[model samples]
Target: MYSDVPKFIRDVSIKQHEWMRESIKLIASENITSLAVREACATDFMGCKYIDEVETLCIELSKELFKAEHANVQPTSGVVANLAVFFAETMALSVPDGGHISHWNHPFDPEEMNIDADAMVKKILEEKPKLILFGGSLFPFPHPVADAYEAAQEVGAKIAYDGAHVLGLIAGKQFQDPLREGAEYLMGSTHKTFFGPQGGVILTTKENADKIDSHVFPGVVSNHHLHHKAGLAIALAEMLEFGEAYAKQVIKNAKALAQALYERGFNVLCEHKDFTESHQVIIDIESSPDIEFSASELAKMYEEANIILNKNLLPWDDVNNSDNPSGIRLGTQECTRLGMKEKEMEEIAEFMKRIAIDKEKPEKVREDVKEFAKEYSTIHYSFDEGDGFKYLRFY
Candidate 1:
């Protein structure tokens, strides 16, 4: 009986679930979904019988709501969605010798891959790519869609955007308009800022609608989960209601946290740009000589303190390390979803400062953070009450 299951499995499961519930989730690509969305996902729908219909309806609704020409609700994750797009582009046209997926000129050097209007033009002139993929993980500012479009026109390249982390906030009108800005295709994840089921969505121009549909249905995703599609619909509906408030709060909290971090002597990126326009903040932990910790070390320290964040690569970093990067990433999406505002951000920043500067014990910091998190723990835009009625709960 004792050997029925591995000890590591049980221990890891319990700890991971506990971490999910208790940790201050500052990861930009994560958020807490509404109860209705959760319930929709757990619904007993195999989707095997009505797979085509379910996928079609989900895509239709998504396209209409988001102002896309076409929509694909399949693809298990954002990466998959992007892969599909890459497949389409590569199949349609021959790529140059060096260019990789995602419009990245050089995958090894992200600094060189910094996308600008001129970069697109240069790529078009050099490679004459049929399609140009844009956007990334740590995109704090809006993508220059117009500039990209202008350049694309000059060189005849199709424009696409990977809005994995910015979908919900952008849907709420908190960010730029990708479709109107001249992007031919847009792909994103539902979970990040959308707080939806874990799935990927693809939107394209009307001219490319049929081709994308064929590419997704018989080409890429054959047996998509119907229940997840329902859940995604519910999440989008929730966004229509509390999106404005949640998005605004996310930005406010980011700015507040960034300001607090800067005041405490952490070299916050884009400090001159007033902290951030999106949910995330990238902090330069290497700036503090007092702390001899690397980004990975800093991340572990924060995790121990029940303050969850990940090490991210900064634009100025020489090392192209994704695992042990040179910067730390923080986000306000989950905190804002929990209804924490500017004041709460200040407190959180102080805790981070204490841990980073004083090298305080994580156990002690976790205790204080647990109490602090409790003080401001209220879910926003819940369907349990009547809030879901204000917006369209799809499922």
Candidate 2:
């Protein structure tokens, strides 16, 4: 019985590993980490400590690494970090309209805090809010953060930037500088483009450091996981060493992949600007006859062919039909992390073309992909280093 149990467990683990190895992961928000980072996470002290020294050190290292006046490494996730900001600002404002915060939607008209840059500026000009929040979900392009910050400054409104998907790329200098661009606060997850541990971080300048610190510590987070903090520190160090190279490659891979997909008759969103200098690429499935199938169905079909992607809504999609979106979202982060570049991206796109355009047998495509993945079997920087870069494993 014990033998069977161990065998079953090993089998399940191997299956998952094989899936990861074979699948062409294009999700912009996902990335593989170095062995050193993975080792740090695994070795970090997990037991509850009185002072949570690990987390404190992580915060300090993060501040030094990112050149931020203050850092909060305790948020369990990115959404929580955003929530903390929203909660702090809402409480601080204490307006009669109960501090309206706008997201992508206007849940409340009078309290519309979450409009676009133009609308946000107009609202601030009209209502003179004490705080302004900016960022979006499917942002493939840079935000007018400088302009928004300047506008907020005119009204003395604090600016908060949600860099959830762009943190790593930004640190790598592949994206704009939100803090320097005028936002008083920045929040994001350590994962995504960062290739760090799974957790949230808030960075702010000296002026707003005290308030944001208080809001994060003894305010929202209590007894945060110290291990994750250590892991985050390791990730920060990794970013300092390799982030620029990684980010540059990520952009190249995304462009190559988008081009390949476009050449195959797929209508990629923002194709005019060459996908807008980011990892994500949105394909308009509605424009392709191959995608006459529903978005979910196409996603399933792609998955069967060992190419993983997600369904996403187009900007003009009907609000009611948001759940069943008309577009598909793909990314180059994971593929780039796995040490795959333009040539590999082209091959993956060809596989997608086989399924989406040529209407080839998915089983045949899956087999072909497996062969392709085996040729690139060894991960260069991910937790497992079979034969690629050994320096990355240590650094």
Candidate 3:
């Protein structure tokens, strides 16, 4: 009787892992850790939870990693870190554009992100909001961080960057710099570009440090998860060695993939701006009838072909169809963490052309893709030992 429990565990959960092993994970917000960090997370202390030593170590490394005056690794998730900022007693202006659902959503001001530089300053000066959240889930081009610096100062608005999707890139110094430009506060999940444990972190100047630190414990987290803290600490160690290279390659791969897809007839967004400057590549399905499917439909199609990505709403699309927007978003983070390069990105682009344009059968594509992924099963950019670790489970 009890055998059925293990049966479903193997058949369903294990089955998912095997599938994930064979699928190309291009979700911009996802990544994998090394066996070192995995083992750190598996210790008996991991059976426990801290704001004590390891958690504090994570915070110290995070501050150094981001060049911040303060760092807190206790928020549990990126949104929670954003939520902590939301809880702070201050007047806030929400980004009216970009993907806020994964950052600061409309319950905040929801300001336009694609506005002209002067128009943005005008709005900031007119509204004179106290806080400006700069970053979003769908961010590709550089934010108007420098552009808004003057307006933010004029309005006494403190600049903040929700570096959720670009954390690893930012940490690796491969993307635009927010703090150096103007943002006094930078917050994001640790997993995205940071390639650490699944959690949130906030890096800020000593100016708002106390306000933020006080809110995290009493605001959301009762205490930190010790296991995750230990894991995060180890990940930070790995970043010191490979972060810059990993982040650089991730950006290069994104640009390559975007270019490849465009050459293959996909309407990859922001072509004039050189496709993308971060870990993400975005495509608008309505750009061409090459694939007469919504972002959701294409996501499903790609899934069937063993490629994993998500549908996203572009600035040009209807917010009404937010659930099934017209844009498909790609990330090169996880694949890069798995040691893929520009050549792999080009190949992956070809795979997309076949599935989305060539109208190849999903079954056929899935088979070949599985074999292609098998060649890239090892995790990189960390202290990963590739012997049996190549076949180790991701979940």
Candidate 4:
């Protein structure tokens, strides 16, 4: 009689570990953490009491990297971070316009978030909101924070930027500086591009620090997951040392991939703006007549070829079609973290073309993808002392 329940779980876990090592991960919202950071996460602090010293270092390192007056590393996730400082009468970008769902209150008007400075200012003047939340999920360019800031002051509204997607770019100085540009608070998840463990952080100036800190502590979080704080501290230190180069290369690879896909007849978005400045690339599959599949189908096919990514909803896509929308979102942060560069991006695009354009069999492409991914197995821009992505078995 086989009565080992743990063995069932271990089999699935080991399979996933093996699959990740063989796949080319392109998901815009995911990244591979450093082995040092992983080691920190797998420590004895899981059931330990709150580690005040480690949390303090995490906060200090966060403040230094983002150049903020204060930093709070308490919220368990990005949504909790936003919950710690939400305004009842806040004005924010519409969800379809790239605003995060965590910031939306209800159905929003499309006219509420035009990216043009003058138009955004007009919206601010008309709304007279108590707070303004800037930033979004699918943002390719910087938000009109400066213009909105001046108008917000006219209406006595404070500005907060949700840098959940571009936090790493902002920290590297490759993206706009929300704090100096006029946001009172800059909050986001640490995993996306920052390469930290799964957690949230909120950054603000000294005057508002105590108020936000209080809200986070007895307000939205209690235990705060101590081991993640330990891992986050190490990640913050790694970012201080290697963030700029990593961020710059991530953007380069994204643009190169977008350009290559466009050249291969994919309807890559923002061709007029040199593709993209951040790590993400968007493809409007519905706009391309040559493509017969929906965004979800394309994504599924890519998975069959050992390529991992997600389907996204374009601004014109209806909310009901979200499950099978018109767009595919890709990011180079994970690939760049694996030491893949512009040339590697081109190869990845070629593999995509074989699947989407040439209509080659997925198994044929999967074999090539496995071999291509094998060449770039080591993680970069970190203090890793062991082989990268090696699934340690303690059984």
Best model per lDDT: 4
Judging by TM-score against the true structure, name the best candidate.
4
Task: Report the lDDT tens digits of candidate 2 across residue range 104-165.
Answer: 23122221222344654566666777766555556566766675665667777788877787
The superposed Cα distance between candidate 3 and the true structure at residue 151, in angstroms, equals 2.3
- Expressed as tens digits, the lDDT of each residue in 1-395 for candidate 4 is 57677788878877887788889999989998988888888874734245778878988898899998888898888887887778322256566668477524212333322376665677787776786887678877677778777778877888788888888888887877889988888889999999999998999887645467655654323455777889999999889989989898988999999999999999987787777788898888888777777888899999999999998877778864367788898999999998998999999999998988788999899999999887777889887735566777765
* lDDT (10s digit) by residue, model 3, range 1-395: 68688667656865676788888999987887787877776763523234367766887888777898878787889989888876764422233246666333222221222335566666787876777887777777667788878877766778788888888888888887888999888888988888787888888888646567777765233455667778889888888778989999999999999999999999887677788888889888877677766678778889999999988776656644467677788999888987789999999999998888888888899988999887877878876646212344444
Residue 285 error, candidate 4, Å: 0.5
User: Which residue pairs in candidate 1 have backbone atoms (N, alpha carbon, C) closer than 3 angstroms, thus clashing?
Assistant: none
Backbone clash pairs for candidate 2 read: 26-331, 102-114
**What's the TM-score of each model vs. the native?**
0.84, 0.84, 0.89, 0.93
Q: Residue 337 in model 3: shift from native, Å?
A: 1.0
Off by over 4 Å in 2: 1-10, 47-53, 91-120, 217-223, 321-323, 377-395
Instruction: For each candidate in the order shown, give its overall lDDT on alpha carbons.
Output: 0.72, 0.70, 0.77, 0.82
Residue range 312-390, candidate 1, lDDT tens digits: 7666555443566678888888888876889888889889888888888888899888777655445685554322112
